[PDB]
Enzyme design. Structure first.
Site, mmCIF file in Angstrom:
data_model
loop_
_atom_site.group_PDB
_atom_site.id
_atom_site.type_symbol
_atom_site.label_atom_id
_atom_site.label_comp_id
_atom_site.label_asym_id
_atom_site.label_seq_id
_atom_site.Cartn_x
_atom_site.Cartn_y
_atom_site.Cartn_z
ATOM 1 N N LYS A 6 0.824 -1.215 0.000
ATOM 2 C CA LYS A 6 0.000 0.000 0.000
ATOM 3 C C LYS A 6 0.866 1.276 0.000
ATOM 4 O O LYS A 6 0.424 2.323 -0.493
ATOM 5 C CB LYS A 6 -0.930 -0.027 1.220
ATOM 6 N N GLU A 54 -11.319 5.971 3.909
ATOM 7 C CA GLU A 54 -11.335 5.268 5.211
ATOM 8 C C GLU A 54 -12.043 6.125 6.300
ATOM 9 O O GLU A 54 -12.933 5.584 6.973
ATOM 10 C CB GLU A 54 -9.904 4.920 5.653
HETATM 11 MG MG LIG Z 1 -6.586 1.420 8.710
#
Ligand SMILES: [Mg+2]
Ligand SMILES: Nc1ncnc2c1nc(Br)n2[C@@H]1O[C@H](CO)[C@@H](O)[C@H]1O
Length: 390
Positions: free
Chosen positions: A73, A177
């Protein structure tokens, strides 16, 4: 007439750990994998005979560091020359190569040298999350919402979609997120009027603070701030250095050069760190740590809090910065949401609650699960195809 539709899933594709949920029967189920874990390491390992993903990959990392990939990521959608990439490569035991200014991870796999794009490694993690969901549901899964950090640019978002497509998933949407954590608490279902929400996300390696404004279910990211050099691994490091010193004092031996002894010490320290979130003390018991010496000791929560005191206080600097950037005062924040396993630390909770003058923190949804929880809520909403009545 019309066959029943498979459930869609929500995936938190995390830097260190990933999580999958499904919204069914008016509620979210966070799905455990076949080793009983509600979160799965975002790790992929390569050998002469196998490709291992998740707990199986992380459990063999000690002896296979060059061919066990983690942190993809941090590379996804970035150029090889990006200064973030160049600095991160110094900490990784696996090889990162330059292919047309795009990073690729290079490993030994099934008798050959093989290089993978970061999206290909992430597609392997996504394939495991899809299989975890299918083991629970008992049928093939097609649709998913995948989350990303709010600071991800267009290239990083497209590379995440590409990872989902390689894994055979139909990506319904890429959602932020912090937005997913807010959705998990139904903070977009409170009606008319503006709400200011602060998401406090303390991970294994990084810390992110986000300020969102929600008006009639519409989200606006008002400010992001954080610390790339602050996470759960730094607290583990402080315990490691403390116990290395303790072994020197007690046995007049320096263990710091036996990698196995340091690794066993760090593993025990991380477990002791977790126990200290629910207990006021924790034991540390390692047999034949170094030179056949058994290491049986303890640490109080007060001593651990003292060891990490500066690190815990530093989480308030990005909070104050995010509030200045959003042009808001702390009293103007309506909701505080905790994300990340490291937020279970009582002292971290106390420091933030004290900063917001005693306010309650939303922590009822397991902080390591809240992002997948919100992504699962959104996935069920996105597949609805209701036709209006007359
Ligand atoms: Mg996280
Ligand atoms: N109960 C807990 N108390 C303190 N820390 C925790 C807890 N549970 C988890 Br999970 N962590 C830490 O969260 C990070 C997630 O990448 C790692 O550093 C874990 O050690």
């Amino acid at each position: 007439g019309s066959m029943a539709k498979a459930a869609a899933i929500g995936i938190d594709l995390g830097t260190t750990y990933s999580c999958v949920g499904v919204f069914q029967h008016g509620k979210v189920e966070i799905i455990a994998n076949d080793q009983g874990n509600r979160t799965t390491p975002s790790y992929v390992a390569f050998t002469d005979t196998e490709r291992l993903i998740g707990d199986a990959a992380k459990n063999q990392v000690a002896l296979n560091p060059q061919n066990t990939v983690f942190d993809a990521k941090r590379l996804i959608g970035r150029k090889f020359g990006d200064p973030v990439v160049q600095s991160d490569m110094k900490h990784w035991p696996f090889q990162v190569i330059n292919d047309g200014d795009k990073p690729k991870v290079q490993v030994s796999y099934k008798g050959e040298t093989k290089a993978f794009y970061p999206e290909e490694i992430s597609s392997m993690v996504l394939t495991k999350m899809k299989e975890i969901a299918e083991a629970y549901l008992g049928y093939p899964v097609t649709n998913a919402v995948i989350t990303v950090p709010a600071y991800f640019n267009d290239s990083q978002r497209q590379a995440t979609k590409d990872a989902g497509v390689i894994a055979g998933l139909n990506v319904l949407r890429i959602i932020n997120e912090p937005t997913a954590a807010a959705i998990a608490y139904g903070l977009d279902r409170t009606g008319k009027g503006e709400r200011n929400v602060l998401i406090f996300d303390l991970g294994g390696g990084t810390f992110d603070v986000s300020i969102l404004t929600i008006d009639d279910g519409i989200f606006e990211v008002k400010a992001t701030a954080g610390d790339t050099h602050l996470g759960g691994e730094d607290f583990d490091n402080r315990l490691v250095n403390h116990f290395v010193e303790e072994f020197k004092r007690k046995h007049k031996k320096d263990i710091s050069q036996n990698k196995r002894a340091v690794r066993r010490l760090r593993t025990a320290c991380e477990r002791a760190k977790r126990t200290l979130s629910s207990s006021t003390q924790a034991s540390l018991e390692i047999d034949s740590l170094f030179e056949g010496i058994d290491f049986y000791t303890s640490i109080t929560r007060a001593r651990f809090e003292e060891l990490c005191s500066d690190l815990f206080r530093s989480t308030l600097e990005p909070v104050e910065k995010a509030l200045r950037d959003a042009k808001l005062d702390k009293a103007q924040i309506h909701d505080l949401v905790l994300v990340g396993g490291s937020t279970r630390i009582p002292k971290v909770q106390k420091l933030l609650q004290d900063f917001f003058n005693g306010r309650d923190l939303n922590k009822s949804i397991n902080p390591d699960e809240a992002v997948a929880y919100g992504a699962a809520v959104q996935a069920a909403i996105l597949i609805k195809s209701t036709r209006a009545a007359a």
